[PDB]
Amino acid sequence: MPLDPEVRNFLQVYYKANIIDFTKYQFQEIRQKVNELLAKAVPKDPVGETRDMKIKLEDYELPIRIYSPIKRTNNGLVMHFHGGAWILGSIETEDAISRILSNSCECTVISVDYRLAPEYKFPTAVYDCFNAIVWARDNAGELGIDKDKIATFGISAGGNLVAATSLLARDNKLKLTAQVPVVPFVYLDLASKSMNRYRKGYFLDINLPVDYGVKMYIRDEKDLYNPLFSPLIAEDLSNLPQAIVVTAEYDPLRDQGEAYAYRLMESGVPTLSFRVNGNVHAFLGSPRTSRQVTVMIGALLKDIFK
Amino acid sequence: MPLDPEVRNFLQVYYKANIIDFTKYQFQEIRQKVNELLAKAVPKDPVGETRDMKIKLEDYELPIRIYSPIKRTNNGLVMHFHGGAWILGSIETEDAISRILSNSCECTVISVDYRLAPEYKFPTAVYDCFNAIVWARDNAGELGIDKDKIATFGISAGGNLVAATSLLARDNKLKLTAQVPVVPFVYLDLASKSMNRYRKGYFLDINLPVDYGVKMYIRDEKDLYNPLFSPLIAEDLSNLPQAIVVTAEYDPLRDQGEAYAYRLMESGVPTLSFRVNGNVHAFLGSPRTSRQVTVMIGALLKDIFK
Amino acid sequence: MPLDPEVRNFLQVYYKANIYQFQEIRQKVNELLAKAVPKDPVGETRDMKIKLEDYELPIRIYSPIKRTNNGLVMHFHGGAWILGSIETEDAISRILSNSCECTVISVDYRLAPEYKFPTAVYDCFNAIVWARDNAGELGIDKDKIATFGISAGGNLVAATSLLARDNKLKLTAQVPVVPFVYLDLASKSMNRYRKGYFLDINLPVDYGVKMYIRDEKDLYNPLFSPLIAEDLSNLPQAIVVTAEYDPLRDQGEAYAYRLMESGVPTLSFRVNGNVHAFLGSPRTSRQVTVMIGALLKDIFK
Amino acid sequence: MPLDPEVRNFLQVYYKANIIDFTKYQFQEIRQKVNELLAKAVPKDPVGETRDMKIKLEDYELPIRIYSPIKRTNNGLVMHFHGGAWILGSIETEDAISRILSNSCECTVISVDYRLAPEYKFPTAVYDCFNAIVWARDNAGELGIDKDKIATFGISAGGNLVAATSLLARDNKLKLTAQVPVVPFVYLDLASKSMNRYRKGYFLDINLPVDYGVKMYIRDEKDLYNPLFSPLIAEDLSNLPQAIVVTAEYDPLRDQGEAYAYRLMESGVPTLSFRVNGNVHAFLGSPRTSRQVTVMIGALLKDIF
């Protein structure tokens, strides 16, 4: 297929490496081996400061990392939820993204280590991320941020959590200035062209009807039509924050993401939606593209934070 | 919207007519208004013979029409389930299709008047259609047909029933030689391009996330992931009859139908799948195309009944 | 990637096989194409030659097992204007004749690079003129002549229809299957499926084109690229067939759209899960030919 | 179709207006009618400074406008070629874009008034744009810009001129750091889906096989396969500058632009290529989107500079 040559070369090496197989490795070792892959993917830019800490929940201590930019020129805040199919990833795996995002936005970024499946099933991740937004708003003065300039950002499962959070934010009348789901999961899509054509041989390998990651995250089949799991099935998608939805051409989740963005437009929400061509899910195998997308998004957020 | 000029004209006249208007018509009146439009759509070709009767079921007497072709060259049988979104249509509305199909197949065709929503909800229609197939097989000798040469055919909601009945056929070890879902509904598709682009202004007008016609047919939201309602969601689609799946280019259901066909191919089932270009759902506004598709289908079945 | 499993397996084998001067490459490919579909029996087969001013053009006349109408189908084989013959598409002619239940005439038009454009187009057109002039001896109706062709054959169907219109020769129908109709560099199908799906094409101008055409000014000639024709109205009723994972898919569909917009009654369908000319799936190839025959039969009824 | 609601509304107003009607209006009137529509499409952001002048060519004096950003943080230069199907448009019609681009890039922007058809046929526009680039390079010290940091930018016919001038730049060993064709015309595309589906009713109305705008710009049919007119037909697309190609989903030119971008990737040119969804050609009817795209472009160029 017509991919970027660097991405094509990455795919050859990735499949030859044989990281994911339950014949040799246990689940925990697969989690770690993929995390090491993701964490080395983009180079780390320097920032102003980095501070690790834990938010105290009634049953858990939720780790976060606060990024301060090299140059801070606004009082906005970006909540960053990492991807990894609800079962892997962390603050470390998308640390390089947070740094570039912070510098481009010229504002504070807070990355969240939400609890993962199979240990903690849906809806734990959604509520962990939402409680972290509520914590940031409650500590707005301490962080030096404006309460009405809080945005959310997330890749893949992180993009799912951005969409799910926005629905909770609306239920609870918590205002968010913006939402940035990048290559999000928003629905159990079985019918689209992107899903059927690129569900195998483009890093993000998905089995149908219900893939491995979803089975591990959800409790049972009734969760499939839950809007916090599948925000696309929501009856109402109006009065949600201004959105920047980003998709990739050879990503199985491409069409559901573009559908979500159209649904927002139709519901009255001001939305930018663009598709990155010649790239696979999450822009893997192309650190140049991954950087450029993050910088573009930062420029737009910075403009909203003005 | 580069449609066939006859189709384009039909849509202009269809929308100006304003048939589906609940302010000035009751549901029963709209059902009849649409039924008259569908019945007059294709002209009736002459056949050998036509026999109306009723199958005796446990709770109902199920009307059927048996068609004998002008020239009967094999002992195949085609069960025909009409379309109409589970809520309208009949043997009369697709009588002209049955006649053309029978002459092209050169074999017997049996059309079924299954019970409709909202009077009878899912899964009544599916079981009425399946029990009609069982009756045909049991009375094979009387009908002069081979038990190994029974095929099923259906348009739209009819195409849904063809997919659903093949799952029951497999469950109950009822041998079918082929299945022909035309422009079928097989899934609650919210994410595909065809659904989002062509769900309004192309005859088949669909609201998201859950359309009016679905709400009338299903009992509750749990039925949305039921394989007999959404066969695309089935975990196993192997060992199903050889399939001829037909879609239309400007049909919101196009992508899910093509997805069904691909899943059959991957599951080992010999499958022909084609998309009819320049046409809307069910080839409406183009009786020529509707005829040609039926003739093609009959020639392929005839070749299977050889 | 999401192809019919039989086709997918064929592609794995095809590229591992690694299928020489040009004239010998022609013969190697022709032998492989001729064994591809098994031959159905027909009523009769007759070889003869049409006398043209500079050439004796070989044809084969097929009579069906059962003849039920006086229609005629002219069959022009594919092979990128540079290879192929009556023999390579003999099995298709037989199935087509039986399905149509009418006489089929296959043409051995002259090939490049020996004979460049527009020779092939004129060889096929003169074959149509011959059949129409000798209708009574053939026992066919002059008003029931259809054309049929796959790939480069599909190109020739489109091109001969333009000449048919220019010269006021009535054709009842035209059936370009997976045709070439334009130098398409911009479509999705072309850019996505031009390597790895049997029909491997280089951009901007492929090897097969370079051999067929005389110079670059032929690229906008309507007899080579019928899609660039100013007027596509008053052409015969069309059955255009394409394949989903074929680089020529979009141009063929475009041709069909242009006909519909020009007032020509058109059926256009795309065969899903298949590559150019339905290679790797003899079942599909047979079924498409059967479907086409049933439609032609209906037009001849 | 599932357009942005604001864009759908713009199309309703646009077709009710009936601007392009050769029964009622002469060509010059239509030119100025469309120029007014393009000029008022996006609001003008304030910049640091604006200067008009003329480059002195052999046979002509080429008007240009120099934009200085509110904040100037690098010594890059972006040459901006306007769109308008080779027959209309000006520095004025795309002035609002130049302003947003200059601010976002935080560098100098120069808009060029190249000569238009039918008065001057192909390849005049291509050479006017190329000579402007050469002038800017020669006067790099006067302008306070680095010779190694010259980029080109263009919309529609402007995008055509960006691709064409990059081929001339390669021929003449003139170095450009980047090229940014937005919704470019790069080929006589008759086969693609986008062309056949969206050539009527989405602002950019195109007739097939050869559109009005092409007939006016081109001398004869032989130019159709000229790489300076159709860069997609170029035998070689390697050693061209780093590219940012931008397309719109409901744009008849969408597929050819994406094809140009892929051809660049295959040829070893580092490229970013994205498609703006729910939008028509040039993001008309959505000034918010048009602004956001230009801001993103500027952020990327700034990062290169």
Could you explain how this protein is built, in words?
The structure is a homotetramer. Chain A has 306 residues and is of the alpha/beta class. Chain A has a single domain (1-306), classed as Rossmann fold, CATH 3.40.50.1820. Chain A has 10 helices and 8 strands. Chain A has helices at 5-17, 27-39, 95-105, 124-138, 140-143, 157-171, 193-197, 212-217, 254-266, 287-305; strands at residues 49-56, 61-68, 77-81, 108-112, 150-155, 178-182, 242-250, 271-280. Chain A has an 8-stranded mixed beta sheet with strand order 1-2-4-3-5-6-7-8, with helices on both faces. In chain A, helix 3 (95-105) crosses helix 10 and helix 4 (124-138) crosses helix 6. At the A-B interface, helix 7 and helix 9 of A face helix 7 and helix 9 of B. Strand 8 (271-280) of chain B pairs antiparallel with strand 8 (266-275) of chain C. Chains A, B: This is Arylesterase. Chains A, B: Keywords: Hydrolase, Serine esterase. Chains A, B: It is an enzyme of class 3 (hydrolase).
